[PDB]
Amino acid sequence: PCIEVVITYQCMDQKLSKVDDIPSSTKNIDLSFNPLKILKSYSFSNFSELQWLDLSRCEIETIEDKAWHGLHHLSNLILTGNPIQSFSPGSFSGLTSLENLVAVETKLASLESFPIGQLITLKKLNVAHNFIHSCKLPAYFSNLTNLVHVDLSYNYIQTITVNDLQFLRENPQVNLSLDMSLNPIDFIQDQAFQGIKLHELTLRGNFNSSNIMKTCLQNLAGLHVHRLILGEFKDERNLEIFEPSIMEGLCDVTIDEFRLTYTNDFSDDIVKFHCLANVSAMSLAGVSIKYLEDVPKHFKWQSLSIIRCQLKQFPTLDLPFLKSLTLTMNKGSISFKKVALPSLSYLDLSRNALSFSGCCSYSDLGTNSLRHLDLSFNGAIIMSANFMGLEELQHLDFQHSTLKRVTEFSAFLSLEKLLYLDISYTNTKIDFDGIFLGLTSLNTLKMAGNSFKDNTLSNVFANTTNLTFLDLSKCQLEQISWGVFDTLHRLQLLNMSHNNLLFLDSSHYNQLYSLKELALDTNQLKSVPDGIFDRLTSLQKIWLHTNPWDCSCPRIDYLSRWLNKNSQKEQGSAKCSGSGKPVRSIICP
């Protein structure tokens, strides 16, 4: 009657009237979009180890008592969209070890009469889109010692008083995050947040007028937030104007991480407002910021994150304690401009359609401790230096960016400590054997989607001894020069699939003593030299499918016998051309 997925059964939208063709061992049951109407008792007694129960949109109007008997392992219960409204006492009897309760849109009216006081294991409580009018954190929250997140979004909370937050003032050891979004808050009582500590406080889409917001943020005074999230939504009520003075109240709040989301009105001054000077992590997302200049040098930001914004110019940054810079998914296109960030160790400038002319050396960044450079998914990156000043670099990513002039010198000569390089799909045509000189520590080389001069794999890996991962797929390779793999004694994965190889040579694989995975599928091979795989003493997986193998005897004898004895290693099925017969099945006379 249902749909067996795995242990996992999917009974969604099956017009069912009640939950019995399911094994007792089942650990996940999705029963949503069924007109169940009543949850009768004893019902789930035969599901001893059920973990995930989804009862969304089941038209349930009544939860009987002990209706959840036998569920001594259920950790996730989801009752979204059920008009049950009145939860009887003992409504959640039996639900031990449950840690995630989703009661969205259940016509719930208050937390004080929510019979969850005995779910000691509970960690997350989502009661969004209900009728809750009060912000009161109820008394029984003291038994819920594992509760760390409460979602009160999309309710009717208008006021925050000192007695609403009484539970946290009494218990400063409690680690709690509150989601207040889409609540029409217009008044916070004086001192209501004094002596109050929260991990994450989300206040998105609450305010319609500038002055009600300024008044309410003033009465945040005394709050300690690890992360404060402010903003609005495009499809909701917005501030007609957003003056930086609206955030005056934040000077009495101690904030570790500040996060600004979309605001209909925005000025670049908002991000440089002085109450943000001592924030340690600053973050913008969906913000219509156009320029980021003149950030006061005494700002103590250690990380800065700019996602899906609208920067017209690459920011000029002098923040002397900034350790991590992220600028990603920027709208339009920008050209890189030099920076001077002497504490910078993490730089992510990916997915910006960014152009970089002068990559790369110390003078571009002003740091000696950069370890992570992500320039992937960008525009043209014109190489002109070989990373002098940047020798601590361990992770370098150019994926899907147009590298230029990288094959015209040893552009990575200083990167003696580099472990991860990705030049895949960078439109590079390699015609210089010394392109990878200096990369003596490299473990991972991903260079898929490129090409080689004369479609020939040249001796470019002579001094990358510590390679363990080498992806050469989709490089249009037609042949391989002698000795190219002689040094790769530690290589564990070699992907040469999706090329145009017509022949192999035994000598290329005679010294891959550490090789575990070898991908030769989707080429043009019709045979292999006898004994080509005989020294791959570490081989675990090999791909040979989508090749036009010639199964005439005695030509295919070695391969057919090798594929049969090592049938556990082959992934996919190498097939004979013409007949489609698997090669492992051929027995030569």
Binding site: E408, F432, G434, G438
Partner: protein, 136 residues
């Protein structure tokens, strides 16, 4: 042959190419230090052609590994930066060119660089030098 100098970290010399021996005197003040150098190139010769469209073909090998052929334009033919772009065929050229480079890591060993000067209007070779750099 033609000229040699050794700096703190480099031995630099050149000669004319085997296929082209047109004379030209090129020197360096100071001797190029590959760690980084500021100075002047002294050029003194009578060109076999007009320099209005002077460019170079550079064929570089580093530790016997061939780099792709390069082409570098000195005189574009309109409002050029150097006075010698005005020189005609047969006219004396004596000039000092300021140069400066730093911040690049040069591999140890020896390089070869043959520089071939072309007059872009005629595509005729004006001279050809065979530099030999030793980095210690």
């Amino acid at each position: 042959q033609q000229w040699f100098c050794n700096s703190s970290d480099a031995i630099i010399s050149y000669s004319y190419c085997d296929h082209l021996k047109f004379p030209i005197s090129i020197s360096s003040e100071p001797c190029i230090r590959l760690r980084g150098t500021n100075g002047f190139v002294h050029v003194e010769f009578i060109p076999r052609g007009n320099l209005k469209y002077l460019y170079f073909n550079l064929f570089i090998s580093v530790n016997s590994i061939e780099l792709p052929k390069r082409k570098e334009v000195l005189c574009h033919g309109h409002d050029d930066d150097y006075s010698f772009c005005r020189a005609l065929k047969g006219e004396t050229v004596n000039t000092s060119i300021p140069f400066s480079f730093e911040g690049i890591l040069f591999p140890k060993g020896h390089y070869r660089c043959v520089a071939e000067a072309i007059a872009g209007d005629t595509e005729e070779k004006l001279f050809c030098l065979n530099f030999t750099i030793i980095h210690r």
